[PDB]
Amino acid sequence: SQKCDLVTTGELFFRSGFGIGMRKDSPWKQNVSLSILKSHENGFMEDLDKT
Amino acid sequence: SDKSIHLSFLRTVPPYSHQSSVWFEMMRVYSWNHIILLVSDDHEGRAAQKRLETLLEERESKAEKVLQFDPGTKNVTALLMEAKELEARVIILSASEDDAAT
Amino acid sequence: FMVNVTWDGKDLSFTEEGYQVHPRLVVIVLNKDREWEKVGKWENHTLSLRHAVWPRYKSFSDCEPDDNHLSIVTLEEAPFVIVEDIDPLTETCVRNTVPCRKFVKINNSTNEGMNVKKCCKGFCIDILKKLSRTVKFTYDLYLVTNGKHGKKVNNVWNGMIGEVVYQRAVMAVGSLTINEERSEVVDFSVPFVETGISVMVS
Amino acid sequence: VNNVWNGMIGEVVYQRAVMAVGSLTINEERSEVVDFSVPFVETGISVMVS
Amino acid sequence: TQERVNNSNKKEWNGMMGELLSGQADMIVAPLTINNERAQYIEFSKPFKYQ
Amino acid sequence: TQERVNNSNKKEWNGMMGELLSGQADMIVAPLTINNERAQYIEFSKPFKYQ
Amino acid sequence: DIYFRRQVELSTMYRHMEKHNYESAAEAIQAVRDNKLHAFIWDSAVLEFEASQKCDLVTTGELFFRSGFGIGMRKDSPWKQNVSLSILKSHENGFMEDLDKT
Amino acid sequence: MADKDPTSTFFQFGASIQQQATVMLKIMQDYDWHVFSLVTTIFPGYREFISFVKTTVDNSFVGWDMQNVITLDTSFEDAKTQVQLKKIHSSVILLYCSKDEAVLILSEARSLGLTGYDFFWIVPSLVSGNTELIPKEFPSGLISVSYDDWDY
Amino acid sequence: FVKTTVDNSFVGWDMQNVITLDTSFEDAKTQVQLKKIHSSVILLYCSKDEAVLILSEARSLGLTGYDFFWIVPSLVSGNTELIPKEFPSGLISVSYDDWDY
């Protein structure tokens, strides 16, 4: 997009998104997942994507 | 021989299943692998045919033809005429008395 | 004079040996109290059982607890899980469809209907089969007729999720979508299909 | 050679090895010496000039 | 991406995953595409991107 | 082809193959094809065509 | 039909052809050239020769289920080995290609 | 009984060993179990049972996958019976014995661990006694088509 | 040691049931424990007399045949001149070098 001298041809394979990782036993897990999902649904993430 | 109907029996004489076994043994080393047989439609003939067939399976072979006639019949010409058009001259007729004579 | 004899409507006849042509066979099982029950009855030509699904009897007094058989809830929609009709001839479920059963309701006060067998196939069913092969667990798939995907109305979840809410179904495979309020009550798994909210105009 | 086989066919006929999987072509002499099974790949003789 | 130590058949991690697992860090907020070998022992979260 | 006998429950070989499984039999030569069901009962020869 | 019933995925797409099959080999061809049917699945040789001769129709597609032809026998007859050897000899002798040419 | 003198007029009201076979086949088909096995001891009438089951499963198209047709007949504790019984891996087992042999076989199978929550023996009629002499070896949940005494 | 050195291997082992015949062959728990061994390689470890007893019991359970490879440590295959009858013909047992050296 920025230095449009190259191209992005071809299809896409092995579809798997990113994420936030942490140890198996951590007291932040469910809350972090809930906050990410809530932001994703109410649209705060789309603003960041546009920006 | 069936233990289901004669649960109280024993004897010191071979049955005719042993006769069929000896048929197989004597035919085995003679180069006569075109066995056909005549069986009377009763209990004895059925047992003899079953024994011969189950013994023949141990050689990966089969009988060329199998025929049956009514017990105590009088007109067997059709059955014999049905047994002529084949290439197995090893008849193993196993009738009983008067049927054998006819 | 006994081969083709009938009397008093209940025709019964003999053939060849002493085999009555129409017997009165029944089926029995060993109840938990060590007595024979009376499930099924081979009346004329059909088994005509009385139990829709196997009641999962306990083997012994010292056997391992049952922790594999479980109930799974899904509904019909989309090219994900579609329910067809049972084949008239060869009364089994084709070759690849799993045997899901739905609660059938008639109409009016006679709407109380039996659990008819209407087995289904689709896309989610393939994933369910692969999961069953991998994790080695047997299921009791059954359709849901109580609502829809789920909406908190009158402070009670209704439809699919509500079942999983009230300890009536340990899994809810199908066409669910992750959410914020939904994920607060039940715990989801990693997504396997991307979705969203798109718009289509002819 | 000298009424003695060698190679894939040589091992099989001398009671040394059952089965001869590989790229073996059904022929006349081979089928006379060692019996084959149903073919699974079509092939023959083809020239190649480009 | 995990690898084996020098001339020893015992697997060990490296990079960000190794730093998190060896009691050094506590959160790994960065592009950390979800996999299966990783997810065996690190509790990921719901994805915040799809690529 | 295999088919169930009408007004019964058994099955029998119909068509041209039924003649082979009967007195006529002998050396059936025709545009036949090789299949598992056909080869289960009778035995074929080396193919004389490919299609 | 044996092939279509064998493949269950094809058995899903079997019904349409199941309730619309014909009862011969050339009558359906006449119907096809009569603008009544537009499809066919038969042996490669028959369809290819028919398309080559009748310069009206052509065969479009890729060969699948490549199973060769074969002369028939019964059970296990003494004629099998010699017949198979003769067929192989004819294949290797160039006789079969010459006969196909004529 | 199986065979009778061709000059007799004695008839019963039971059921032959062929009808019970189709009854258990219908039981297996209705609940969609399909895959099964046929462990049988040696007893007058076992060959007929095996042949009838083979014929019924052959002349039908429902996709029955019958494998490991065992015919254990030598002792009940040596190597042969142990390995042959171990070979089984189905989820439905269809046996054919005579009470005492059946209880011995079931005890051996339980000792091997074949009678958990996911197995269903379908032994027919013969091993059902008079329905009032239950030994302390038959696992609860054992199907056995028998005759009706409560019905009429 | 076996459990610890099997978790760090890339070859993908297939760790299965581990048994412990605590009783002195009481024929109640030992038989049922030994009966459910569906593997093909056994890594027995016991004393010489206990190994003889276990192998004698196993021979009658249809557990040793043409394809059943036992592996035994050195302390069982001890003095290599008092081989009993119960030892199957063919079993790998690493020991020390008393022939050469």
The two beta strands, C19-20 and C14-15, are antiparallel
Stated length of chain D: 50
Cα–Cα separations (whole angstroms), residue C176 to A19, C183, H47, H92: 21, 11, 54, 35
Rounded to an integer, what distance in angstroms lies between the CA atom of residue C174 and that of residue D6? 62
Report whether E33 belongs to an annotated binding site.
Answer: yes
Experimental determination technique: cryo-EM
Helices (H) and strands (E) in chain B, counts: 4, 2
B-to-H residue pairs, Cβ atoms closer than 8 angstroms: 12
G69 phi and psi angles, rounded to 5 deg: -80, -170
For B71, the token pair is 């017990």
In sign, the C-alpha dihedral spanning I54, I60, I61, I67 is positive
Q: Are D12 and D20 in contact (CB under 8 A)?
A: yes
Residues from chain E that touch I8, judged by Cβ atoms under 8 A, are 9-11
The answer, for E36 touching chain A at a CB cutoff of 8 Å, is: no
Rounded to an integer, what distance in angstroms lies between the CA atom of residue C170 and that of residue C72? 6
- Cα distance from H55 to chain F (closest Cα, Å)? 10
H-to-I residue pairs, Cβ atoms closer than 8 angstroms: 20
CB-count burial class (<10 Å; 0-12, 13-18, 19+) for B18: exposed
Chains A and G contact (Cβ–Cβ under 8 Å for 3 or more pairs) = no
Rounded to an integer, what distance in angstroms lies between the CA atom of residue G97 and that of residue G102? 9
Nearest residue in H to I34, CA atom: H112
**Element containing residue H26 per DSSP (H, E):** helix H19-30
Rounded to an integer, what distance in angstroms lies between the CA atom of residue H145 and that of residue C29? 9
F positions 1-51 inside 8 Å of D (CB): 34, 46-47, 50
Report whether H48 belongs to an annotated binding site.
Answer: no
Beta bridge partners of C101: C117, C142
For G24, the token pair is 């011969």
Helices (H) and strands (E) in chain F, counts: 2, 2
Beta bridge partners of B37: B66
Chain D positions touching chain G (beta carbons under 8 Å): 26-28, 31-32, 39, 42
E strands, H48-111, are 92-93
How crowded is the C-beta side of C192, counted as CA atoms within 13 Å? 13
The answer, for G7 touching chain C at a CB cutoff of 8 Å, is: no
For B99, the token pair is 């049927």
**Nearest to residue H24, comparing CAs of H104, H126, H111?**
H126
Beta-carbon contacts of C179 under 8 Å, excluding residues fewer than 6 positions away, are A37, A41
Beta-carbon contacts of C81 under 8 Å, excluding residues fewer than 6 positions away, are C74, C75, C120, C121, C122, C123, C124, C125, C174, C175
For H130, the token pair is 């008079």
Does H15 contact C138 at a Cβ distance shorter than 8 Å? no
The answer, for E11 touching chain I at a CB cutoff of 8 Å, is: yes
Beta bridge partners of C41: C26
The answer, for I85 touching chain H at a CB cutoff of 8 Å, is: no
Q: Is G50 helix (H, G, I), strand (E, B) or coil?
A: helix
Helices (H) and strands (E) in chain H, counts: 4, 3
Q: Are C176 and C165 in contact (CB under 8 A)?
A: no
Q: Are H114 and C64 in contact (CB under 8 A)?
A: no
Chains E and D contact (Cβ–Cβ under 8 Å for 3 or more pairs) = no
Q: Is F12 helix (H, G, I), strand (E, B) or coil?
A: strand
Phi-psi region at F32: left, alpha or beta (left = phi > 0; alpha = psi -120 to 50): beta
Beta-carbon contacts of C200 under 8 Å, excluding residues fewer than 6 positions away, are none
Does E46 contact C178 at a Cβ distance shorter than 8 Å? yes
How crowded is the C-beta side of A8, counted as CA atoms within 13 Å? 5
Rounded to an integer, what distance in angstroms lies between the CA atom of residue F29 and that of residue C99? 46
The answer, for H79 touching chain I at a CB cutoff of 8 Å, is: yes
**Nearest to residue H41, comparing CAs of H115, H120, H132, H123?**
H123
